[PDB]
Structures are given as structure tokens and as C-alpha cells.
Design a protein around this ligand. Sequence first.
Ligand code: CLA
Ligand code: KC2
Ligand code: KC2
Ligand SMILES: CC1=C(/C=C/C(C)=C/C=C/C(C)=C/C=C/C=C(C)/C=C/C=C(C)/C=C/C2=C(C)CCCC2(C)C)C(C)(C)CCC1
Ligand SMILES: CC1=C(/C=C/C(C)=C/C=C/C(C)=C/C=C/C=C(C)/C=C/C=C(C)/C=C/C2=C(C)CCCC2(C)C)C(C)(C)CCC1
Ligand code: SF4
Ligand code: SF4
Lengths: 79, 49, 253, 86, 104
Amino acid sequence: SSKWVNPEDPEMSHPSGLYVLPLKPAKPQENYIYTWKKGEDGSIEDYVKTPFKGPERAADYYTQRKGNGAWDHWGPQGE
Amino acid sequence: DNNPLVSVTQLPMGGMWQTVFFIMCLEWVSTYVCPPPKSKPWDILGWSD
Amino acid sequence: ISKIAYLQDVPRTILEADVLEKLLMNTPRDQWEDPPEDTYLYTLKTFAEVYGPGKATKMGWWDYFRLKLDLPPGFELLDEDEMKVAADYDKLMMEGKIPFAVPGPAGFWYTGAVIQWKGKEQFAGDQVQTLTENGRFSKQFLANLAFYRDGLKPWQRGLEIGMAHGYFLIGPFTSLGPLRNTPEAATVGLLCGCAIVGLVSIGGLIFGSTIKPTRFDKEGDKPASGFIEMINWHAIGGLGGAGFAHALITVFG
Amino acid sequence: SHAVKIYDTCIGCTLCVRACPTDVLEMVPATVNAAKQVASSPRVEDCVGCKRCETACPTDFLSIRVYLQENEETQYSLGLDLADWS
Amino acid sequence: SETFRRRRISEIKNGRVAMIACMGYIAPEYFRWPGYCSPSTDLKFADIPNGIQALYKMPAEAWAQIGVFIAFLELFRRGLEAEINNGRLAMVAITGMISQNAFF
Ligand code: CLA
Ligand code: KC2
Ligand code: KC2
Ligand SMILES: CC1=C(/C=C/C(C)=C/C=C/C(C)=C/C=C/C=C(C)/C=C/C=C(C)/C=C/C2=C(C)CCCC2(C)C)C(C)(C)CCC1
Ligand SMILES: CC1=C(/C=C/C(C)=C/C=C/C(C)=C/C=C/C=C(C)/C=C/C=C(C)/C=C/C2=C(C)CCCC2(C)C)C(C)(C)CCC1
Ligand code: SF4
Ligand code: SF4
């Protein structure tokens, strides 16, 4: 009764072991970093989440990670 | 000499100028790099955040 | 209260009126009906149900002695002000505010200040507020460090950082090196400081080649280009600062 | 990740499921035993390897076995908190 | 751009300091201030030399105090065209004079 379908082997269950498909957000969160934001009137904030165009660290190790699963092994249903 | 006013004169000019320079640097940092808010000019350490 | 049978007309001998009032105030209201077994109110209930008007009006000397031993005196229970202070303390801590204190000798002093312990992200342990990192002075100082300063090119950042690093690095070898007593102490220390600058810059180049930070990179530029530029200019600035310190030492003895 | 396997000696007492710290296991209908249920391990990706299921297993030798695989360690099996591999 | 503005400020400043250095090179030979530059060590302006030798001669304490004063100063349109042109001339003159003193 699990909606998840195993991509590698349809007969077996999905590696996730879940029964409800994921819910996508209205707009996916964009990459950001916590930095200061000088207030233009002498003030300054400490942890201000500000957009970041690309990966904070462009190493192949960092960028290869998609978060779909432990090894990104979940099918398209993971997203 | 134990008298502090005599000890000032007994101290080397090296140490005296080092002290003056250190206090000048502290003042510069506190008044230009990390100026206190206009509402609390005495809040040097930025407690009012 | 009147609805409590055992609390009605409790004889003065079993417990004084003032001490009874203090005990009731200290105890939670919900526990008056049937207090837990290990409480002064439970002892009072158990013994008032057996002794008092309309019941046993006498007690053995030893039984009364034990009863007075195990019932509370007035000074043992908390006062109104003490209970208020404890309640305010707990309320502050639960609201996420911390009555500021600094540890002292085998203890901590209260500075009289209430700070906002919890940050913008309540569940984030990285964002708990502290004067050391989240105060205005600390924020401004860290933001104005060369690594962070606004409107600075990576070469400027690296040059300033390296100037500082080399200038202070030459000294330890000059003063405490094997050749510290020889006439070439300053020059050997300068060489050692330049070597240290080179080693740390090589480490930074490895870091930028492996992790590749992209916070200093220009738009549409190779990843970690800004970081590598900053590290190269840190090497240059370290050489320059070491040389300047050595020149000052040599010229001014 | 570790390998959590269940064998037919299972009697379906649910103690492994109740002892699971990260909810890797779940009871499923079966006809092999009198209890008419056997523990399963669908979410083995979350198994940390604490062997609390193994501790709670009653059978003479365990009807549930956790095989540790240090080479295939993931962040979920390592319980990483300060660092994120996702 | 930002680089041009920074370079303009740097040039103006290097020109001002170069006029100052040229004047400080020229004046001492003509005349020198009296009054025991360093009374503690019995040092006087007539005794101190002019040029790169002053760096070694006058005490490191005096040089450090001068440096502290400059640090305080730093930390705390025909006229402008003439200023910048004279800055260029003075920079050339001071670099030439210092190079000549060091070489010879
Ligand atoms: C930690 C203990 C220790 C200390 C204090 C020293 C000290 C010394 N050793 Mg060493 N040594 C040690 C352990 C130590 N050794 C050990 C374990 C061994 C055996 C492997 C040796 C073997 C050894 C040899 C064979 C020799 C020395 C020598 C020396 C001298 C020069 C070292 C040098 O060039 O440093 C270079 C120093 C630096 C690069 C700077 C690092 C330290 C700075 C000052 C830290 C500053 C941090 C700062 C406060 C942060 C502020 C941040 C922010 C707030 C601004 C010096 C007296 C030499 C000598 O001739 O001695 C007389 C020498 O030939 N040592
Ligand atoms: C006010 C704050 C202050 C700061 C922040 C500060 C920092 C540093 C640093 C780090 C940045 C270094 C590396 C450093 C080094 C030396 N300091 Mg110094 N110093 C300060 C104060 C004094 C005083 C009062 C005296 C003094 C001295 C010396 C001597 C002695 C040399 C010698 O005796 O040959 C040496 C080597 C004495 C002196 O100049 O004696 C002639 C002296 O009286 N310092 N000092
Ligand atoms: C232009 C920048 C400048 C300023 C703003 C400035 C301010 C003050 C103040 C103000 C608060 C005091 C109180 C003071 C005191 C002394 N100064 Mg100083 N001074 C400056 C420059 C020089 C130079 C070039 C020399 C010098 C000296 C001395 C001596 C020691 C004399 C001696 O040697 O007996 C003493 C007592 C001489 C020196 O250190 O000689 C080893 C020396 O040559 N100063 N100086
Ligand atoms: C920002 C900046 C900076 C930075 C820095 C950094 C970031 C660094 C890092 C660095 C690094 C990152 C380094 C590294 C190092 C390394 C090492 C130290 C290694 C070692 C190794 C080993 C030990 C190995 C071994 C082996 C072999 C080889 C083979 C096989 C076996 C074995 C494994 C044993 C600087 C200061 C420049 C300046 C300013 C700016
Ligand atoms: C906390 C504390 C402190 C600390 C301090 C410190 C940490 C300091 C630092 C210091 C430092 C660390 C300094 C440094 C400086 C540096 C310099 C001053 C440099 C300069 C340089 C130059 C000038 C260069 C040049 C060049 C180049 C760059 C290249 C080419 C060549 C030439 C030569 C041109 C004290 C003790 C006060 C006490 C109180 C508390
Ligand atoms: S694995 Fe063990 S505890 Fe779990 S149902 Fe089977 S026999 Fe019972
Ligand atoms: S080892 Fe621990 S986490 Fe893994 S299945 Fe057994 S009880 Fe659950």
C-alpha cells in the first residue's frame, strides 16, 4: 500500500520505506547564507539570511549532493 | 618610585608612547569602526542589541 | 480554604496559624485536596484528621515531640518575596530570556541585566545571543575585519591580512630562535617568517583547490578564483610585512 | 548503511519496534507464528546500529539481526548533527 | 571607478607627502631648529645629520613618537590642478633625492 515505487527494482519496496509521497513547496527555497546587514543608519544585524547565487563551496564533493536520499538513490518521486 | 607621578617620569619613553598609541587605537576602534548608537553614546560594548 | 475539612480550625498546638498559612501558600493549590505522601501538608492532614476538637484531645509526650519535630517551622518555608523571585526567574528562563551572569571565583555574579538568549531561529543553537558575538561592538568589529570588510577586493583583503601576519611572525624566530644571540638573528628570523608565510599560503591554496570557497568570487568567474587571489596576495603581504619588520629592527636596533 | 534482517523465528512481540530509536521497524501481518505478525525493517536507511532491537529480542537467538557496515556509513547511520551530507 | 578614485586619493596624498619630504630635505642644510632635540641623551639638531642618516641617528623613541603623531593624523579647480601637478613634481624630486642619497 506504499505509493513509493522502487526505481532500481520495481518488485522490491522503495528503499525509503515510506508510504506517503513527498509534498513539494509552492516555491523551492533558494540557496542562502547568514551574514551581517548594515542598517544604513548605524545598526547591524548578525544572522541575516541573504541569497547566494551558487554553491557556497564549489567542490565536486559538495556539489554532487542532491539530498534525494542517503546516496541520492530515491527515484523521481523523492522530489 | 612608588609615587605614580614620579614613576611616570621614571618610565621609558618607549613604554609611554606604547601606552598612548594603544589607547589611541582603542579610541579609534570604538569611535570609527564600532561607533556606539546615537541614542546610547555610552554603550561602547553594544549591550543595546 | 473553607471547603477543606482538615484545614478547618486546626488546633494551634498541632500547627500555628501563621505557619499553616505559609505552608498553604508554599504548597501548590491543587495539592491541598490530597497532598503527596512526603509533604508537610500531608503530615498535617494525617495528624489533624486524628487530633483536634471532637477527636483525641491528648497525645503522649513522645508522640507530640515527634509531631513537632517533623512538622515545619515558619522559617523553613519560602517567603512571599522569595516565591515571587523564583517564579520570575523561571518565567524568564521559559520565555527565552536570561538574567545575565558571569562566572566568578567558584561561582557567578548577576550583572542585573536581562538579555534575549534565544535568537531569530528559536530552535537553532547557532543563533543564541551573546554579547561576545551578537553585541553591536562585536558585530561591527567582525564585519570590519579584512576577511569581511565591505567594498574590498580579494587582493586588498589578502594583502592586509598577510602584512599583519608576516609582520608579527618574524619576531618569535628573531627573539627565541637558535641564532637569537648571533648577529644574523634578525635576518634568520625574517627567513623563518617568510617560510611560515609561504607554508600557510600553500595550505590556503590547497584549501581553495579542494573546498573552493566562492564567497569572494566575482559574478561569472571561475569558482574559488577570488579566494585563490586573496591567498596569493596574503603571501605577498606576508613577505612585505616580514621585510618591513626586519628593516625596522635593523634600522632602529 | 547497516543491514537489519528478520528471520521467521520471529514471534511478533513488537519489542524490537518499541525499542527502535529512529523508527526503522514496523510490524506486518503474517501467518508464520501464532501472533500473526512479524517485524519488518523498511527504513533501514535510518538504522544507526545501536542493536537495541537485538537487546530486546526474546527468542533463543535473535530473530532480528543488525549487521554493521562501516564502509557504507551514511549521515543517518552516523547520527551526524553538526555536519550535513544532504 | 573605484580603482580610479582610490588611485586619485593615493596620488594626491603621495604628492602632498612628497612636497613635505622635499621641503624637509631642503630646509635643514639652510637652517636647523635649536633646542636639544633629545635633551636626555644630549642630542642637538646641529649634531644630527640630514638624510637617511637621521633614521639611525635620532632615537627610535623619537621616530616612534613621530609615527604615532602621523597615525593620529591619519586615523582622526585650478588650485587642485596646481596641487596635483606640484605633487607630481615633488614626488619625482623626492624619489630622485632619496635614490641619490642612498646610492652615493
Ligand atoms: C609548547 C611548548 C614549547 C615552547 C614554548 C617552545 C619554545 C621554543 N622552542 Mg621548542 N620545542 C617544543 C616545545 C616548545 N618549544 C617541543 C615539544 C620540542 C620537541 C619536538 C621542541 C623542540 C625545539 C627545538 C629543537 C628548538 C626549539 C626552539 C624553540 C624556541 C624557538 C621556537 C620558534 O621558533 O617558535 C616560532 C614561533 C612562532 C612561529 C609563533 C607561535 C607562537 C605565537 C607567539 C602565538 C601567539 C598567539 C596569540 C596570543 C593569539 C592572539 C590572537 C588574537 C587575540 C589577536 C623557543 C624557546 C629552538 C631554540 O633554539 O630554542 C631556544 C630550537 O632549536 N624547540
Ligand atoms: C600599554 C599597552 C602596551 C601594549 C599593548 C604593548 C604591546 C606590546 C607588544 C604587542 C603588540 C609587543 C611585542 C611589545 C613589546 C615590548 N614592550 Mg610593550 N606594550 C604596552 C606597554 C608597554 C610598556 C609600558 C613598556 C613596554 C615595553 C616593551 C618592550 C621592552 C623592550 C626593552 O626593554 O628592551 C618590548 C619588547 C617596555 C619598553 O619599551 O621598555 C623600553 C615598557 O616599558 N610595553 N609590547
Ligand atoms: C611631532 C610629534 C610629537 C608629539 C605630538 C609629541 C608630544 C609629546 C608630548 C605630549 C603629550 C609629551 C609630553 C612629549 C614628551 C617628550 N617627547 Mg615628544 N612629541 C613628538 C615628537 C618628538 C620627538 C621627535 C622627540 C620627542 C621627545 C620627547 C621627550 C624626550 C626627550 C629627551 O630625549 O630627553 C619627551 C619627554 C624626544 C625623545 O623621545 O628623545 C629620546 C624626541 O627626540 N617627541 N612629547
Ligand atoms: C583565509 C586565509 C587563510 C587561510 C588558511 C587556510 C584555510 C589554511 C588551510 C590549510 C590546509 C588545509 C592545510 C593542509 C595541511 C595538510 C596536511 C598537514 C596533510 C598531512 C598529510 C598526511 C599526514 C598524510 C600522510 C599519508 C601519506 C602521504 C600517504 C599514505 C599514508 C598517510 C595517510 C600517512 C590564510 C591563513 C592563508 C591567510 C589569510 C587568509
Ligand atoms: C588583544 C590585546 C592585544 C593585542 C594586540 C595585537 C594582536 C596586535 C597586533 C599587531 C600586529 C599584528 C601588527 C602588525 C602590523 C603590520 C604592519 C605595520 C605591516 C606593514 C607592512 C608594510 C608597510 C608592507 C609593505 C610592502 C608590501 C606589502 C609588499 C611590497 C613591499 C613593501 C615593503 C612596500 C594587546 C597586545 C594590544 C593587549 C590588549 C589586548
Ligand atoms: S524481531 Fe524479536 S522482538 Fe521483534 S517481533 Fe521478532 S522476535 Fe519479537
Ligand atoms: S540497530 Fe537500533 S536503530 Fe537500527 S534497527 Fe535496531 S534498534 Fe533500530
